[PDB]
């Protein structure tokens, strides 16, 4: 299924995922399209952060959901 990943800069990125993919998979696709390393990416959906060991299905993310991508704070 497809899902929408909205960025801080107002851009909308389009992904093709499968329910069983883990959150680290999704950040990794964001990297091959935008170059943003996974360690710097935060996925927020409905006000709640998404965890790398969890799956898209564990958060009840369905077709055409809009996931919000927020960048991590400064760490040095």
Protein described:
The chain has one domain. Helix content is 16%, strand content 30%. It has one helix and five strands, in the order ββαβββ. It has one helix at 23-34; strands spanning 2-6, 12-16, 41-45, 48-49, 66-71. A five-stranded mixed beta sheet has the order 2-1-5-3-4, with helices on one face. A hairpin with a 5-residue loop joins β1 (2-6) and β2. It comes from Homo sapiens. The modification (Microbial infection) ADP-ribosylthreonine is found at residue 66. There is a cross-link at residue 76 (Glycyl lysine isopeptide (Gly-Lys) (interchain with K-? in acceptor proteins)).
Write the layout of secondary structure elements.
Layout: E1 2-6, E2 12-16, H1 23-34, E3 41-45, E4 48-49, E5 66-71
Parallel strand pairs: 1-5
Antiparallel strand pairs: 1-2, 3-4, 3-5
Cross-link (Glycyl lysine isopeptide (Lys-Gly) (interchain with G-Cter in ubiquitin)): 6, 11, 27, 29, 33, 48, 63
Organism: Homo sapiens (Human)
Cross-link (Glycyl lysine isopeptide (Gly-Lys) (interchain with K-? in acceptor proteins)): 76
Care to give the gist of this entry?
This protein has one helix at residues 23-34, and strands at residues 2-6, 12-16, 41-45, 48-49, 66-71.
Q: Roughly what percent helix?
A: 10-25%
Kindly state the number of beta strands. Answer: 5
* Cα-based radius of gyration, to the nearest Å: 11 Å
Q: Give the structural class.
A: alpha+beta
Give the end-to-end Cα distance, rounded to a whole number of Å: 38 Å
What is the count of structural domains? 1
Strand count, sense and closure of the main sheet?
5 strands, mixed
Instruction: Give the percentage of residues in beta strands.
Output: 25-35%
Dominant shape: globular
The spatial strand order of the largest sheet comes to 2-1-5-3-4
Output the number of helix runs. 1
- Helices and strands, in order, run as EEHEEE
PDB class: signaling protein
Keywords: Ubiquitin, signaling protein
Assembly: monomeric
Entry title: A tensor-free method for the structural and dynamical refinement of proteins using residual dipolar couplings
């Amino acid at each position: 299924m497809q899902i929408f990943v909205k960025t801080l800069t107002g851009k909308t990125i389009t992904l093709e995922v499968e329910p069983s993919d883990t959150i680290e998979n999704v950040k990794a696709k964001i990297q091959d399209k935008e170059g943003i390393p996974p360690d710097q990416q935060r996925l927020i959906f409905a006000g709640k952060q998404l965890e790398d060991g969890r799956t898209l299905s564990d958060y009840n993310i369905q077709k055409e959901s809009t996931l919000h991508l927020v960048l991590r704070l400064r760490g040095g």
